[PDB]
C-alpha cells in the first residue's frame with residue numbers, strides 16, 4: 055500500500071538526517087583520504103591532532119565511548135519517525151531506547167567497517183583491524199567480535215533503505231523488560247516489521263530469505279550486546295584508569 059511504501063521512505067528519511075554517518079558515504083570514503091591508524095605511532099599522531107600539548111588502550115576505550123553517546127542522542131531523534139513511538143508512554147520510550155541503543159550501534163557500525171578496519175573520527179580516520187587485535191588484553195577483545203558480525207552482516211548487501219527499517223525494528227522490540235503497555239508496542243513493532251518484510255522483498259528480489267536472515271541477525275546482535283556489556287564491566291571494575299561516561303552507565307544500569 056502506498057501508505058506502506060511511504061512509511062519506509064519516512065523512516066529512511068529520518069535515518070539519513072539524524073545519523074552523521076551512513077553506508078553510502080562510508081563506502082564513498084572507503085573507496086577513494088582517511089588517516090590510517092595502524093600502530094602506536096599513528097595512533098599518537100592522530101591523538102595529537104586533537105589535544106596538542108593515560109595509556110593507548112584506555113584512550114581508545116574513551117573514544118568509542120564518545121561515539122556511543124553521540125549515537126544515543128541521534129537514535130532518540132530517529133525514533134520519532136516510527137508510527138506510534140512518540141504516542142507511547144514516556145517510560146516505555148526510555149526502556150525501548152535503553153535496550154535497543156547498543157544493538158543499533160553495532161548494526162550501523164558495520165556500514166563503516168570492512169575486513170581491514172573501520173572508519174572513525176567522522177570519516178577522518180581509519181583504524182586497522184589488526185592494530186585493534188594487537189592491543190593488550192582485554193582491550194583487544196572489544197572489537198574483533200564486532201568485525202565477525204559486520205563481515206557476515208555486510209555480506210547481506212543491505213543499503214541505507216534496509217538498515218533504516220532494520221534499526222527501527224530493533225527499537226520496536228515488544229519483549230524488552232519493564233514495558234508497561236506491551237500491547238501497543240507489539241502493534242507498533244508489527245507495523246515496522248511488516249513494512250520491513252515487504253521492503254526487503256521489493257528491494258532484494260534475488261534473496262527472498264533476507265527477512266529470516268535479518269531476524270537471526272537481530273538475535274545475534276542481542277547476544278553481541280550482552281557479551282560486550284560484560285566486557286565493559288570487566289574493564290570498568292578492573293583497569294582503574296578506565297572511566298565510564300555517566301549517560302552510558304545509566305544505559306547499562308539494570309540492563310543485562
Ligand SMILES: CCO[C@@H](Cc1ccc(OCCn2c(C)ccc2-c2ccc(SC)cc2)cc1)C(=O)O
Pocket residue numbers: 114115117118119120121122123159163172173174175176181196197286302
Ligand atoms: C568499549 C566502548 O564500547 C562502546 C561501544 C562502541 C565500540 C566501538 C566503536 O567504534 C568507534 C571507532 N573506534 C574504535 C573501534 C577505536 C577507536 C575508535 C574511535 C576513534 C576516534 C573517534 S572521534 C569521536 C571515535 C571512535 C564505537 C562504540 C560503548 O560501550 O559505548
